[PDB]
Amino acid sequence: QDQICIGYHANNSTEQVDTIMEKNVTVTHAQDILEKKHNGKLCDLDGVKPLILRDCSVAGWLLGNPMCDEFINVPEWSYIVEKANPVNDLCYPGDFNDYEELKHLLSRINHFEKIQIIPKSSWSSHEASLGVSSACPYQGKSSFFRNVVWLIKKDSTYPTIKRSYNNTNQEDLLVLWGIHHPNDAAEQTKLYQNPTTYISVGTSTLNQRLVPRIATRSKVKGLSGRMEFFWTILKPNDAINFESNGNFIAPEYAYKIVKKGDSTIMKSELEYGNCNTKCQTPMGAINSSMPFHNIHPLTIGECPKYVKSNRLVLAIGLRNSP
Amino acid sequence: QDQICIGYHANNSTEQVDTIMEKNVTVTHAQDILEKKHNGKLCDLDGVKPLILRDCSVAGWLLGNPMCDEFINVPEWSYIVEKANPVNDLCYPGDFNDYEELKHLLSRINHFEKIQIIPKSSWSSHEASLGVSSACPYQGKSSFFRNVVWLIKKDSTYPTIKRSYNNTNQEDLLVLWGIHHPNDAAEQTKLYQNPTTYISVGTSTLNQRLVPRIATRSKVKGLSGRMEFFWTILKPNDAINFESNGNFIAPEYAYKIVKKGDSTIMKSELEYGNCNTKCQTPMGAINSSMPFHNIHPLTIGECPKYVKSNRLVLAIGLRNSP
Amino acid sequence: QDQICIGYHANNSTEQVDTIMEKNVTVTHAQDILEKKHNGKLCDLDGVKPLILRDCSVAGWLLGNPMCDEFINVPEWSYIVEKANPVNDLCYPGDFNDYEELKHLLSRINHFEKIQIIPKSSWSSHEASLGVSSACPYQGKSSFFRNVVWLIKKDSTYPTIKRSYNNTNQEDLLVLWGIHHPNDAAEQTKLYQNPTTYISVGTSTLNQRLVPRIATRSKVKGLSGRMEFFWTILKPNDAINFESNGNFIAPEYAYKIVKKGDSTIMKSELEYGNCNTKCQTPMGAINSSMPFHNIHPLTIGECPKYVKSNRLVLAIGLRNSP
Amino acid sequence: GLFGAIAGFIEGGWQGMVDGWYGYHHSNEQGSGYAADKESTQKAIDGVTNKVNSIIDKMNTQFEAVGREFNNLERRIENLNKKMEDGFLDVWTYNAELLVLMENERTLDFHDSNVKNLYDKVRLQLRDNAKELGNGCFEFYHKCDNECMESVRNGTYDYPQYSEEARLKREEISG
Amino acid sequence: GLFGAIAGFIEGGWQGMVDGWYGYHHSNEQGSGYAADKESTQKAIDGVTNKVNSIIDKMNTQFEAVGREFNNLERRIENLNKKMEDGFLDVWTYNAELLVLMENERTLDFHDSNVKNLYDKVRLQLRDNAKELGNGCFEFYHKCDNECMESVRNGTYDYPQYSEEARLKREEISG
Amino acid sequence: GLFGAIAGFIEGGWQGMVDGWYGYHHSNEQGSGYAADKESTQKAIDGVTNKVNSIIDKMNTQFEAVGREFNNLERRIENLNKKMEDGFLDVWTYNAELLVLMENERTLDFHDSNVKNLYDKVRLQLRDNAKELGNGCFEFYHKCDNECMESVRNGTYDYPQYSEEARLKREEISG
Ligand SMILES: CC(=O)N[C@@H]1[C@@H](O)[C@H](O[C@@H]2O[C@H](CO[C@]3(C(=O)O)C[C@H](O)[C@@H](NC(C)=O)[C@H]([C@H](O)[C@H](O)CO)O3)[C@H](O)[C@H](O)[C@H]2O)[C@@H](CO)O[C@H]1O
Ligand SMILES: *[C@@H]1O[C@H](CO)[C@@H](O[C@@H]2O[C@H](CO)[C@@H](O)[C@H](O)[C@H]2NC(C)=O)[C@H](O)[C@H]1NC(C)=O
Ligand SMILES: *[C@@H]1O[C@H](CO)[C@@H](O[C@@H]2O[C@H](CO)[C@@H](O)[C@H](O)[C@H]2NC(C)=O)[C@H](O)[C@H]1NC(C)=O
Numbered sequence A, B, C: 001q002d003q004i005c006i007g008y009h010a011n012n013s014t015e016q017v018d019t020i021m022e023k024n025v026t027v028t029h030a031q032d033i034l035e036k037k038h039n040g041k042l043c044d045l046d047g048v049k050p051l052i053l054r055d056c057s058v059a060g061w062l063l064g065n066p067m068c069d070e071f072i073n074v075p076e077w078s079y080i081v082e083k084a085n086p087v088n089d090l091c092y093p094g095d096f097n098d099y100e101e102l103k104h105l106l107s108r109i110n111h112f113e114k115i116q117i118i119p120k121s122s123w124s125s126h127e128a129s130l131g132v133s134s135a136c137p138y139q140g141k142s143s144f145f146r147n148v149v150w151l152i153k154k155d156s157t158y159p160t161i162k163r164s165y166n167n168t169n170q171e172d173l174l175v176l177w178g179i180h181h182p183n184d185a186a187e188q189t190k191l192y193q194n195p196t197t198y199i200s201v202g203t204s205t206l207n208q209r210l211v212p213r214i215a216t217r218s219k220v221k222g223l224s225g226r227m228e229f230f231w232t233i234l235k236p237n238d239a240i241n242f243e244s245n246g247n248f249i250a251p252e253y254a255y256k257i258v259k260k261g262d263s264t265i266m267k268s269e270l271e272y273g274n275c276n277t278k279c280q281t282p283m284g285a286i287n288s289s290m291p292f293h294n295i296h297p298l299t300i301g302e303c304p305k306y307v308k309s310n311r312l313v314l315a316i317g318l319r320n321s322p
Numbered sequence D, E, F: 001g002l003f004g005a006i007a008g009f010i011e012g013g014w015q016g017m018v019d020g021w022y023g024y025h026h027s028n029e030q031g032s033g034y035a036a037d038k039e040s041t042q043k044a045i046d047g048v049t050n051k052v053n054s055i056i057d058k059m060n061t062q063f064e065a066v067g068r069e070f071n072n073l074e075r076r077i078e079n080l081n082k083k084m085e086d087g088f089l090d091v092w093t094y095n096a097e098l099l100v101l102m103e104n105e106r107t108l109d110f111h112d113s114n115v116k117n118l119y120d121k122v123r124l125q126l127r128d129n130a131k132e133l134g135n136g137c138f139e140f141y142h143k144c145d146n147e148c149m150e151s152v153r154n155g156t157y158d159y160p161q162y163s164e165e166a167r168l169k170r171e172e173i174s175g
């Protein structure tokens, strides 16, 4: 006899789906909404390559720590990559004042260009060549940071330095200088001559006056002295004025800076991988369209929402009990 | 052959609605859940009018920058409106210590009243009338902030100031003072007489000792000197004690303060509009009941949730296909 | 003639449930998803008891404020409980530098042990026994913080202190010291002999130079002088070097510290209640499995989500109308 | 639709019925016209209204002040703020959009369902006294005047009273 | 209801049935009583239980410590924290409230649907051996003793076995 | 299921139908085979696809940079950040998981509903020309060749054309 029957599609698929009321419902077709894959590489971010510091910290790179690879004129970058614990930071032990705010400022840069601000050859009343340390070796020789000059007394005198630089460039200038804190009065006398000493720095905005702190300290790299660095942004057509009695670590090179946006410093052990993304992770980039991911919390770019889940499977087809 | 039929309402409406499974479904009636309209005005917030600083900054208004409008005393406000870049800030160049915390503190005030704390006429050993600058013009003449006094040596002497004020009022007192950092030793001698100088300020809680910093600085408004301002809250029945050798910018007026709640500083170019609201935006107020809006992120008051959406239309009626 | 009927369960229950379309629908059985109950007690958190300071502040407990209960050695804790306004804080008035960061650091501690770093008996050129105040009463009499030593001139001299301590323990060392700010020059001369004075402290990381501030101040407990305290973490095999001319409040006891996780300081008026939890509230612990609660915002531990609601009732059974 | 009613067998809405959401059309000897089922309709209105009101009222609103109070040496904090604001904006946007979609779907399906349920109610009243045409209409085998049809709506249709007349008309048309 | 069962044609619950959620009432010669369908009922219990448990278990909880650690010269930061806590409070409250409403609706409709499905199951078993009264009850055209009715429940009703007897009563009670 | 179709009376899927989601099987004289209803199926595909796409596209994504920029005397701020990130993680996880659950339920019920609606469509076409077996199958009382069955699917079944033949078979089938 004749029949007409109504029914629905089925197949051999094993795609499973969960439901508010039921678990592990086999289904005809399914789509995961959760991104789990990354390329294990460090890539450009929206067409702009990152500043990859290898075994160099930001401080070590900016002051030119001799052991850091030689100045990569990268004129532009979208984020900065540092290793967890970079080997080449401050070769001479010490500190960087407002360091983290500086790193954040530099994290994304539209234009960067190192320029000579005060030639080394221009210190005629002071020694500019003896400011060298075994803790800062360049090739078995005692050297020093390359962008900044350790001035020392000439003969047995350190006359007062008064030096000014007017930013005639068209861009902000990042200027860096430092002060040396010795171990005792004897060393103070030996390096600079004057016993009581200062560095004043003035801008349209900056009103600074640094005094060295003598204190007995533990040796780091065999050294008890310390170097403390400072920085400003000098606006176009402003000048910066240095006056100092000694312990001055003078600028030589500064940086033209153009800043348009902000990112952060990524801590990652990876290497550049000649690609591009909209979303970078320290474990690799994400080629994304999915609204969620479970790769890693520490992302930079236009990324899907981080979630604690291994699976977000939408049912599209129908129950496929067979 | 008579008939009885079942059916549903229809009309000529073109109200559309989206659905999880279908887009642009014409429907009989709909209700938008998203607020998109504002009145383009600055209003009271829950009955309390805002402190509208015109081309004055908070610092400019508190110290009485001569170029800021003098107005009748606003004794109470719910929030503060500043322009993005106010023209009258610190007429003499310099800084306000802990400025943003002060602005936050002042953002909503229950009671505010300026009172004279130390009369100008009371500085008999010092000049109180020459503390005047072309960078602070009042009526074509060199003037100074109105609420604070720039003391200068009288004849050729600046005897030590020791002055104290006991808060016999019933409210906290906002007290403001300052220090002047000159350009060189000569100016230091010309203005105050003493070469090495200080300002100490003590409270039940404050233990301050300020020393001027001489440094060579760029001119701002033609000036290389700087003025740095400080402040405290003096509790009822506490006293404040000033001692100073020079470079003291003394209080004259202080403020009775009653604080009960907090808001923020709104940056807006608008003007007062004699209205009231529960939710104020820098583009205008929101008359709200809707749970969502898309006006502007920077709101003050009881506001709906900010959202990136042009449309949140709930279907109420039924499919209205033709 | 016979019947077969289909129907559903009913009972006398009055459990009500709300619905997107309907309110107060009586129902057969229901389950609340919102936790509202707490035990009114302070409990261990995941097996670790809290450090309960009674009428003592963290500063008062660390420096050994004489009026605080005698240091019972709690070697480990999961969080710290303070009363809203503890009565025994700094017995001699003043300040703790970076205090909140110190409290946060101490909020959860894996190992804590007080040790003697510099014996009192070891100050042979200075008085170590007269550093005593009526504001710090102990065993009848004028005393001082117990962990720290107020050094005073011996005969009429205060020779320069240079003292160093090498952390030969295997754990970080929390070291505390202080500086005394007097009321005038006379007092400066009376206590220490030298008029112009300093304290320098040096580590592998710390480079500090403190100067006392003379200023006229309000009496707090009858005293105008102030005491300001400082601290570091000394790493294993690092040393700390103190040099000072006067106004030095020297370490005596320091603390071995092992930190593995973080919590916070709970403000609560409750007492220990010999229990255990995964979620502690200042009103009491929560025995939880429910995903939401309405007890109190300020929780420590693995807690359900805080919500503004009195009721979250899921329908499980069916409509149970009359 | 989920319930094959609204855009299924009843292929269209009646502009003639304006006094409700769901109801009836009839044509007899005495004339043709519309009536509206005031029970299914008002229940539906209460439902949908409650839905809207509850999407609106569950929202907790508290006083907040926002807010650009951090200076140019506090840009890390400022960035923390930005990430938070942005975060909430994404959350609320996604949730509000999806909520609207989902609940709109539910609402149209609810209408579908109400229509279908009215249909089946009438269908169970009439049984074989009338033929299902398959367009939401029932062709009567007997004579149904105004009083009879109001009894169909009212839920008070007397099936045996017409069963015979219908029974007669029934076997006829079949050849 | 969505499925017109629970408050539709079966206009009321039985306090007499206490051993399940859905089931049967019967009245024959041998007596009247209640029985409960243990299959539809236990499946429903499993479903709802799973729903509750999953609204509960999907919540991630991790250690947090909160927290008033900023001083009076850090009120901007303190305000940032306030905005954050308040934000999450709003999100969680709105979400929890709406989730409860939505799922409660789904639950009641699930019950409705289960009931309706049991009804249609029986209906398909009996066909014309019984009449649908329209209250969830079937008036038998034949004689259904305890064994017969337990066969209705069990899904083991022998339709042809009574079809004739029924046919007589029908085509005699429809007489 | 909600609509008692998919795992209700049609107890099982056809591996034989591979060209759609819902459709027909037939057996006559000329042979047996499968056909697929391309209308209900494509409408379903459009619906589900739209659902997925809208769960995906409603998500706002904007640039963020995260982010460990605070030092060891800024651990209170660091903790504020932690609480924020953890907060969002919890929000998003709970929402995503529950959304998937809920919408998956809705999807399977959508399938159920489509199947049921196709069934009733056919059922309304055939009436008493065929018997409902109760497994989603209709045993024809007349002769339905390929052209006839294609007319059942197409929605073009000529009921009166076979009503008599059917009426006969129906008759001979009883006594
Ligand atoms: C020489 C002498 O003893 N001076 C007497 C005044 O000090 C005294 O005025 C009273 O001052 C009291 C302060 O006494 C203390 C204290 O804290 O108890 C006394 C302490 O022994 C001393 N400790 C040390 C190491 O010097 C301490 C210390 O100098 C200050 O705290 C430093 O700032 O001073 C107290 O404030 C009373 O309120 C006040 O009456 C008067 C009256 O006795 O006579 C003087 O002889
Ligand atoms: C940096 O150098 C430029 C150029 O010399 C200075 O700008 C000039 O300032 C003078 C002095 O009053 C003006 O009269 C000129 O009109 C300025 N020229 C330009 C291009 O503006 C500038 O002031 C210098 N900066 C400082 C702080 O010394
Ligand atoms: C500020 O002035 C008040 C008013 O005289 C001072 O308070 C009085 O102190 C004396 C003791 O010298 C007592 O007799 C009174 O009871 C006090 N009045 C009150 C209301 O406390 C107060 O000490 C002064 N504050 C300071 C810091 O000098």
Ligand SMILES: *[C@@H]1O[C@H](CO)[C@@H](O[C@@H]2O[C@H](CO)[C@@H](O)[C@H](O)[C@H]2NC(C)=O)[C@H](O)[C@H]1NC(C)=O
Pocket (backbone or CB within 6 Å): A218, A219, C166, C167, C237, C238, C239
């Ligand atoms: C603290 O004292 C210890 C023990 O004397 C010092 O540790 C040793 O230092 C010497 C060099 O000075 C080495 O030869 C040893 O191998 C070190 N031991 C270890 C385990 O590190 C330590 O240098 C002193 N610290 C300071 C800062 O002076």
Ligand SMILES: CC(=O)N[C@H]1[C@H]([C@H](O)[C@H](O)CO)O[C@@](O)(C(=O)O)C[C@@H]1O
Pocket (backbone or CB within 6 Å): B130, B131, B132, B133, B134, B135, B142, B150, B152, B181, B182, B183, B187, B191, B223, B224, B225, B226
């Ligand atoms: C009180 C006083 O003597 N003010 C004089 C100052 C000060 O010398 C400097 O501002 C100090 O930095 O310089 C002026 O040119 C000015 O500002 O108008 C003249 C002015 O009368």
Ligand SMILES: *[C@@H]1O[C@H](CO)[C@@H](O)[C@H](O)[C@H]1NC(C)=O
Pocket (backbone or CB within 6 Å): C016, C024
């Ligand atoms: C709504 O529910 C609450 C709790 O049962 C009850 O107090 C109140 O009376 C109810 N409102 C109505 C409509 O009666």
